[PDB]
Design an enzyme around this catalytic site. Structure first.
Site, PDB file in Angstrom:
ATOM      1  N   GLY A  79       0.852  -1.304   0.038  1.00  0.00           N
ATOM      2  CA  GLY A  79      -0.070  -0.094   0.067  1.00  0.00           C
ATOM      3  C   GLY A  79       0.906   1.222   0.009  1.00  0.00           C
TER       4      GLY A  79
ATOM      5  CG  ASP B  97     -15.031   3.751  -4.639  1.00  0.00           C
ATOM      6  OD1 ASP B  97     -15.343   3.896  -6.032  1.00  0.00           O
ATOM      7  OD2 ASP B  97     -13.711   3.361  -4.605  1.00  0.00           O
TER       8      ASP B  97
ATOM      9  N   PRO C  33     -16.682  -4.091  -8.115  1.00  0.00           N
ATOM     10  CG  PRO C  33     -16.798  -4.966 -10.080  1.00  0.00           C
ATOM     11  CD  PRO C  33     -16.963  -3.506  -9.285  1.00  0.00           C
TER      12      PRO C  33
END
Ligand SMILES: CC(C)Nc1cc(Cl)nn2c(-c3ccc4n[nH]cc4c3)cnc12
Length: 377
Positions: free
Chosen positions: A19, A111, A114
């Protein structure tokens, strides 16, 4: 080669991804659960099986280690590289149940996409579930790594941009609306190819080209998804509404609905609102004459006086041969098939618009106790 902080343990060798600002995630362990472990520099309950769990946080002299419910894959991986016992409708249901739970807690995802809907590792019963998560995971080119972020935009999340571009629950229903079509169409978006979606969305220019106009399951899906992605937010149904939609009904619940409105009607007036609203536009549904469109052994058994163009009478007929399904000739039981599965498919396959027609028509009785399982308050 195993770090142990508090109840959290992991092997530094097992990196699941990366990240921002030196954020790593490891495959790890907690309370004998297979979990993801995010180690982070520190920044300055009411759970549900379908929202991702944050189990435990533990610190050493530098980092914070957070134990996250581990997932097997991403919904976009499920849908695209479809080489994966759990079926698409149940996936969407779990996802909507999660989303409905979040909404009850006055939480809005903003938000939903998928990459945000995760597929769990199989539990102890070999069952797999959908998980709504803050962070979306993304295709890295190795084995086995993933990108994670809590932001829309970012590569490669484009094509799925926060519909807010003060958000209400209606931005989520819109998002899910696209996910529904994304799953059903096996990987397409209701507002077209990636570069033109934003333009199409803002003008409500949607196209559900994968949903055939004369196929019952597609017709039912189209009805819901259209309303979910409605250009006007205030025409969009709450997450609880979506759960009540025939899209999720079992063949048994479907047939039971049919029998319910049938019973509700046979004492109505034929002039009144209820029956008239049901008959408006019902000739295409019934196919002008539905006796012309059912199998030969069945219309022989009807040879009673049912109006061939009446939706009510069709529903009434379906009711009788279900109420007398034992007293029927063996010839018409094997043409109708078993009860209820083969029985209800006997009609919905031939009359693709019957359920959707009757559903929207019988909203005049949505407030009734009889139709409680079929409509939301
Ligand atoms: C074995 C792979 C497919 N599993 C996972 C990889 C990664 Cl990179 N993240 N992850 C999570 C996850 C879920 C939520 C997070 N918030 N911040 C970092 C998070 C990581 C759950 N299951 C996996």
């Amino acid at each position: 080669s195993v770090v142990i902080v508090g109840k959290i343990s992991f092997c530094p060798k097992d990196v699941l991804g990366h990240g921002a600002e030196g954020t790593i995630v490891y495959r790890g362990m907690f309370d004998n659960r297979d979990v993801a472990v995010k180690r982070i520099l520190p920044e300055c309950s009411d759970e549900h099986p379908n929202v991702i769990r944050y189990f435990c946080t533990e610190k050493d002299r530098q980092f914070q280690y957070i134990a996250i419910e581990l997932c097997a894959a991403t919904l976009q991986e499920y849908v695209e590289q479809k080489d994966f016992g759990l079926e698409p409708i149940t996936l969407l249901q779990q996802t909507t149940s999660g989303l409905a739970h979040l909404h009850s807690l006055n939480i809005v995802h903003r938000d939903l996409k998928p990459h945000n809907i995760l597929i769990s590792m199989p539990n102890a019963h070999g069952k797999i579930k959908a998980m709504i998560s803050d962070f979306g995971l993304c295709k890295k080119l190795a084995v086995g790594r993933h990108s994670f972020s809590r932001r829309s935009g970012v590569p490669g999340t484009e094509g799925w941009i926060a519909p807010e571009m003060n958000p209400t629950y209606t931005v989520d229903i819109f998002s899910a609306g696209c996910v529904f079509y994304y799953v059903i169409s096996e990987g397409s978006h209701p507002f077209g190819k990636s570069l033109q979606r934003q333009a199409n969305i803002l003008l409500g220019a949607c196209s559900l080209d994968c949903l055939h106009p004369e196929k019952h399951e597609d017709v039912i899906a189209r009805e819901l998804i259209e309303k979910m992605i409605a250009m006007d937010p205030q025409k969009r149904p709450s997450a609880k509404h979506v759960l009540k939609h025939p899209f999720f009904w079992s063949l048994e619940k479907q047939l039971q609905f049919f029998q319910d409105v049938s019973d509700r009607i046979e004492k109505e007036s034929l002039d009144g609102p209820i029956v008239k609203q049901l008959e408006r536009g019902g000739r295409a549904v019934v196919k002008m004459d539905w006796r012309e469109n059912i199998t030969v052994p069945l219309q022989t058994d009807l040879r009673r006086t049912y109006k061939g163009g009446s939706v009510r009478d069709l529903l009434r007929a379906m009711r009788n041969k279900k109420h007398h399904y034992r007293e029927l000739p063996a010839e018409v039981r094997e043409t109708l098939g078993s009860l209820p599965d083969d029985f209800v498919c006997y009609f919905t396959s031939r009359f693709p618009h019957l359920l959707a027609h009757t559903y929207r028509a019988m909203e005049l009785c949505s407030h009734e106790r009889l139709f409680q399982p079929y409509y939301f308050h």
